[PDB]
Amino acid sequence: NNFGAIL
Amino acid sequence: NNFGAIL
Amino acid sequence: NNFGAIL
């Protein structure tokens, strides 16, 4: 799971 | 899991 | 898991 920014 | 920024 | 910045 992603809980931040993947720029 | 990602809890920060992956720029 | 990542809890910081990966620039």
C-proximal residues of B, 1-7, CB under 8 Å: 1-7
CA-based angle B1:B5:C6, to the nearest 5?
Answer: 90
The rounded distance, in Å, linking the Cα atoms of A3 and C7 is: 16
Identify the DSSP state of A6.
Answer: E
Give the position of tokens 């990542």: C2
Torsion, Cα C2 A3 B4 A7, to 10 degrees, reads 110
For A6, half-sphere exposure in the C-beta direction (CA atoms, 13 angstrom radius) is 6
Residue of B nearest to A3 (CA): B3
Give the N- to C-terminal CA distance of chain A in Å, as an integer: 15
C-beta of residue B7 within 8 angstroms of C-beta of residue A6: no
Please tell me the experimental approach by which this structure was elucidated.
X-ray
Furthest CA-CA distance within chain B:
15
Give the position of tokens 């620039």: C7
SS3 B2: strand
The CA distance from A1 to the nearest CA of chain B, in Å, is: 5
